[PDB]
Amino acid sequence: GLSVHTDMASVTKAMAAPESGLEVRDRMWLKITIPNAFLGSDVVDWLYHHVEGFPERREARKYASGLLKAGLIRHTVNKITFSEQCYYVFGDLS
Amino acid sequence: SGLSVHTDMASVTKAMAAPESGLEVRDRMWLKITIPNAFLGSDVVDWLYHHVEGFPERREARKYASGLLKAGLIRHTVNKITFSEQCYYVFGDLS
Amino acid sequence: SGLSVHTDMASVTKAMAAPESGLEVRDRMWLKITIPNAFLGSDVVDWLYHHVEGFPERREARKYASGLLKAGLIRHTVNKITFSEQCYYVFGDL
Amino acid sequence: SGLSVHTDMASVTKAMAAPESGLEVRDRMWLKITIPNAFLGSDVVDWLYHHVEGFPERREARKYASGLLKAGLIRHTVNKITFSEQCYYVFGDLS
């Protein structure tokens, strides 16, 4: 039904139709170059392994959330709540 | 040994930020965007090779996909010109 | 810069494999499998809630779906017992 | 409309399983496997291009990555022969 002889716009319209078989998703992943960034779970891990006084990892997560509230670490996107799957940078440490 | 829950917060943070602290710190971040009906360039190429007659090899279906981008029939999700199988695309104006 | 196309390949790889090399390493991988007519647990829960009368709220549609898995009317694709909306399923022997 | 909590369960399932039932189906699924220290082919190519001098463009860094897979210095996690940026690898025997 379709070939290299078919006009391009018609081929694309067929590809864009319901049930065409094109594999699609409602999410995408993008890589941004940001100097000196770090993953929320990596902060929590570092705290739990290098800072004494956390009985369970849950308490390290809570400290990292405190760090964000104080502006010692900062969100890279417009977000308020602490999250382990988000990326962060250091605050003003002057 | 040396840092505890009793240490000043700024000083902990500055320990974590020093060179050689062990914190995984790198020049990148990954972000999840919700974009309904987006698609990888490799899946366009696969669809074309499987549904459009006359591609002697897969590389010819890749070149045709690049032609779709050039024409505006598909569009990059970010500001980039060259076609790549690893990037995400959406459909252009099909009205 | 200390590495180039003149460096032996084995040494370049041991550099990439070193701690703190820069290379993103994580303890996971995602595998894509072709399985005609598979579906997410959430897609089952949605269909029951929209098409079967008498559920007071969505949670009871979730419990019904878990009942379908117990009965073998739907099946996990991997060896697992607990029903989850995020997992993939196929139909049982009907 | 026709189906309720009083309907036998097998019949509800057969209705859900019929063509045009409205059930969202797919023919691809994604499985997560816990593999220690695995990495994407794309991150290999990014690392090489960023840290190894003498690549005129990124495609030469990819060709180099492919060199590494042939030599067994890196290894596919599933039985695939050719190098792909979208697949996951682990290191080979490094002593």
Residue numbers in the entry:
A (entry chain D): 416 to 509
B (entry chain C), D (entry chain A): 415 to 509
C (entry chain B): 415 to 508
Give the text the authors published on this PDB structure:
Purifying lipoyl-tagged DEP (Lip-DEP416–511) by size exclusion chromatography (SEC), we observed two main peaks, corresponding to monomers and dimers (discussed later), in addition to a higher mass species. Thus, we crystallized the monomeric and dimeric fractions and determined three structures at 1.84–2.06 Å resolution. Remarkably, each structure exhibits a swapped dimer, regardless of the crystal form: namely, molecule A (turquoise) donates H1 to the H2–H3 core of molecule B (light turquoise) by extending loop 1, and vice versa. Thus, two DEP cores are connected by an extended β sheet, composed of two antiparallel β strands (each made up by a β1β2 tandem) that interact with each other through backbone atoms of residues 442–447. Interestingly, the solvent-exposed “underside” of the connecting β sheet presents a hydrophobic patch, made up of a triad of hydrophobic amino acids (M443, L445, and I447) located at the DEP finger tip of the monomer. In each crystal, two DEP dimers associate with each other through this hydrophobic patch, thus linking four DEP cores into a cross-shaped tetramer. The hydrodynamic radius of the dimer determined during SEC-MALS confirmed that its shape in solution is larger than a typical globular fold of 44 kDa mass, consistent with the extended configuration of the swapped dimer seen in the crystal. The dimerization defect resulting from mutating E499 and D460 can be rationalized by a striking salt-bridge network between their negatively charged side chains and the guanidinium group of a key arginine (R472). Notably, E499 is located on the loop between β3 and β4, and its salt bridge with R472 appears to be mainly responsible for tucking this loop under the DEP core.
Wnt signalosome assembly relies on reversible head-to-tail polymerization by the N-terminal DIX domain of Dishevelled (Schwarz-Romond et al., 2007), which enables this hub to transduce Wnt signals to cytoplasmic effectors. In addition to DIX, Dishevelled has a PDZ domain (Post-synaptic density protein-95, Disc large tumor suppressor, Zonula occludens-1) and a DEP domain (Dishevelled, Egl-10, and Pleckstrin), separated by long flexible linkers peppered with phosphorylation sites, and also a binding motif for the AP2 clathrin adaptor (Yu et al., 2010). Here, we use structural analysis, as well as biophysical and cell-based assays, to show that the DEP domain of Dishevelled undergoes a conformational switch, from monomeric to swapped dimer, to trigger DIX-dependent polymerization and signaling to β-catenin. This occurs in two steps: binding of monomeric DEP to Frizzled followed by DEP domain swapping triggered by its high local concentration upon Wnt-induced recruitment into clathrin-coated pits.
